[PDB]
C-alpha cells in the first residue's frame, strides 16, 4: 500500500507513455494502478509516465 518507490536501475523508455528514470530516483505512483506497469511521477526530475514494476522497490 506504499506509494513511493526507488528506481533500482536506469531505464530508457521505448514509448511516449513510459517514464525514463535513473537508478536512485524516487518515484511516486499516481492514481489507480494494476498489472505490471504503473503510472508514476519522478520526485527527482518532475517527469511522469508508466514505469515497469520490476525496476523499482518500495521506499520512504
Amino acid at each position: 500500500g506504499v506509494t513511493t518507490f526507488v528506481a533500482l536501475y536506469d531505464y530508457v523508455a521505448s514509448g511516449e507513455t513510459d517514464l525514463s528514470f535513473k537508478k536512485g530516483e524516487r518515484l511516486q505512483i499516481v492514481g489507480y494502478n494494476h498489472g505490471d506497469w504503473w503510472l508514476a511521477h519522478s520526485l527527482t526530475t518532475g517527469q511522469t509516465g508508466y514505469i515497469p514494476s520490476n525496476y523499482v522497490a518500495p521506499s520512504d
Partner: peptide, 12 residues
C-alpha cells in the same frame, strides 16, 4: 488497461 498489462522489460 493494456498499458498496465504489457510485458515487462528484462532486468539489466
Amino acid at each position: 488497461v493494456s498499458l498496465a498489462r504489457r510485458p515487462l522489460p528484462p532486468l539489466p
